[PDB]
Symmetry: D2
Subunit: 262 residues, 4 copies
């Protein structure tokens, strides 16, 4: 048996799977978990794949890129996603996390997919809310957007940010789809003094990119090695990966030159 | 119309193709070239894909990682492959290049696929040999193996090296095939004082890895930035990409610790 | 390389092809010819396949099912199709043929696909017209509809029919899609006293069916063996295939019972 | 989710599947059962597909072509297969059935797939043997080979036949694999006075053919319509389907002329 994902209008991927473990459709989302001989378990969340085998990669990368570049981490915000592993890694810091996901049904259906599901859901500092209006208002130190946000989502989130604030969001892969990344950066630049694209080194499995945005916090210059070396039980993240994540070939640097708010 | 690419026994890539441009076949190799509306022409060599519009990435990376890490390039050896674009990039240096490939028929089949085909083959300093035995006896400043060599091939090429020479070869990607990479490193660690794995940053479309091995030349410590900046016409290679290529996830740095040599 | 056709929302077919020989899109149709090791050449005409290898099967079947059941064959009409092979088989009778196809571009693009292209286009009795209004008006002895016609197309064609008239049209396969065939028959029954479904015995390659409609001509009882045995250069059609074409399993006979105007 | 079926080295069928229901495996066979939203459950036995909702077609056809062409059914032999639905249909007659299949594990694996599983296995007159040698010595009125037998297997079963017995076996479809069918006929023509090929009408989803061979019983001339009409609970088999199964295209009647025996 096999399943397929379109990573491009001219490129698909075929995955051999040994079984279908779960299926839960919602009035807004559809999730399906498959058993994989390669990735252990593959979760298909609305035309996007998640490999149980490599949940530590993106979770460790985003969480610690934020954590190790911020002097103070007390309030975090995570919108537009179901990734509780990000949360598990962020808790390796002394911080509070506000998770906003309206789709409980889908979210709870990850009960076995995410290794640290319970450890995250039962954290005293972890508060899960259906929507934004369900949270005490305040300004955060780090905001995460799990789906490429638009100009509005960007603005709405930028005001909920502290002067010191940092915003890490998702976009397409800078090489495969430089035009998408270019647009994602332009949007980010409109309100942030620091807008820089990066990727997950060695994570050769997804057409995905990311942007590190802020008002006055540089992702390379404000990296604090001591916070890095102090982290425990990390299997992917380190300083080499962090810096390498921002490497760009010659041409691409030229292409994103003025959209890159370094 | 589509073609496929087996990155793994449980994972495939599918490229929409507009036409088949060539179908050549020898006693040892078969080569097909297709037209894609996005990746330009795609060449399928023994189920290994080559992209015309992106040939420069791997050629510049491999050639210049060598050229910018060595004082002078006088004698270079290329074996087990058909990559004329690598020699083209190497000809930026005033060096001689010995190119061994018994399959003339397939090699010349690249007359249109390689944009610098004729320029490379007409170089006074380019020697195409059917086999290593037809070559003059001598040592090389740098040797390139375009296929994963077994420990016996390594032993053989190893001795055709100058004391300060560099041996660069291909291996499997360390993310999806760490066990393979590991073995590729121990086989190198056997006769070389330096043996470090690296990948091609931003190249998400390939399940391929490489090793920089030598007797004492260091891929990072012997890096000559002046040589890197002199390369004004390259489109991919730069210092950031050079260093970034050696970055390893924390767990891979650890599993590879024993075989890696700096 | 390969191509794919959806024969069902839950069933597709994958065809290995060695090359793409032709591509001509029209302001109404799209045609693509592929070279096949199995079928010689595959023509993809707007989501439907044609196998050069087996053009004699359907052409011989429809042409002679009409021809050998009609006492007199002098005027024939063919609408909604590009199949000139039907025409080649019908000319094995002393009859005139009116081919109505507005898309000359696509039609002419079959120049090499249809074995008897020129022999049919240059027949003195073959008149090709862009539309119906481009033909002398008259009543025909046999009408062929190459695409499942609707209630209107059915009526419009039924009046252009002689008292003795016969109408052979296309529909889905009676077993795989009994609901479609059921509808096709109901429509036909509304105006014809004789409506009977049939298939191409042994032509296990398509989700296709056909209906033999008329006012007073039975496809099994009015079959004239002498006209059959008199036909020359036929490789598929004979009396066994003709009668077998109307065989229906027990259940299906019950399903189509009152829609079958035998 | 999809699975595939290789009807030809250049042709494949792809079925959308909702779930995998079983994965059994023995020393000689592997069996997987899937749930399809249309064909009910699909069983994949050594890359040969079986459809639960349509098992009756082949079982009724094979059993009753024999039963309605013989005076009395007292001893029947089934070999080289797992088709219990064939025996079920044969039990409409008061006959004994010897069923040989060394792979008990896989056979019993059909406990839910075959709707009449238990009824067939609990029949006092059904004997399941691991091999032909564990059986009592005797002659059969009818023998069924569920796999294409080579000329050696034929020779062997041939002798376990009553003088007026019938040997029915599987072969390749004569439309796509005429050469194969041809050979299957000459091998039968070798020891049998009657040898005629036939297919399963309206069964477009299978690349399978069959042969009715005997010493003198004729599949059409010895057909007993009374026996056919007595079968009021069958859903497919009837006289029209019986005769229609032997119909051959004009060119196949000719190429097969020498090996076919009536």
């Amino acid at each position: 048996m096999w399943i397929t994902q379109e990573i491009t209008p001219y490129l698909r991927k075929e995955y051999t799977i040994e079984a279908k473990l779960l299926d839960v459709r919602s009035e807004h989302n559809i999730l399906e978990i498959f058993k994989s001989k390669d990735f252990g378990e593959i979760a298909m969340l609305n035309r996007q794949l998640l490999f149980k085998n490599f949940l530590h990669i993106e979770s460790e990368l985003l969480a610690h890129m934020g954590g190790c570049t911020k002097k103070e981490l007390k309030e975090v915000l995570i919108v537009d996603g179901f990734d509780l592993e990000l949360a598990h890694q962020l808790f390796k810091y002394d911080t509070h996390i506000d998770f906003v996901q309206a789709d409980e049904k889908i979210l709870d259906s990850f009960i076995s997919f995410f290794p640290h599901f319970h450890e995250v859901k039962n954290n005293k500092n972890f508060t899960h809310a259906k929507q934004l209006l369900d949270l005490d208002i305040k300004k955060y130190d780090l905001i995460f957007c799990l789906q490429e946000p638009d100009i509005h989502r960007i603005d709405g989130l930028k005001r909920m940010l502290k002067e010191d604030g940092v915003f890490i969001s998702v976009a397409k892969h800078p090489l495969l789809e430089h035009v998408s990344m270019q647009n994602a950066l332009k949007n980010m630049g409109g309100v942030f003094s620091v807008a820089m694209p990066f990727v997950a080194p060695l994570r050769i499995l997804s057409n995905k990119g990311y942007i590190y945005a802020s008002f006055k916090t540089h992702p390379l210059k404000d990296l604090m090695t001591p916070k890095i070396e102090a982290l425990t039980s990390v299997r992917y993240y380190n300083e080499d990966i962090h810096r390498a994540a921002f490497a760009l070939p010659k041409n691409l640097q030229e292409v994103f030159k003025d959209n890159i708010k370094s």
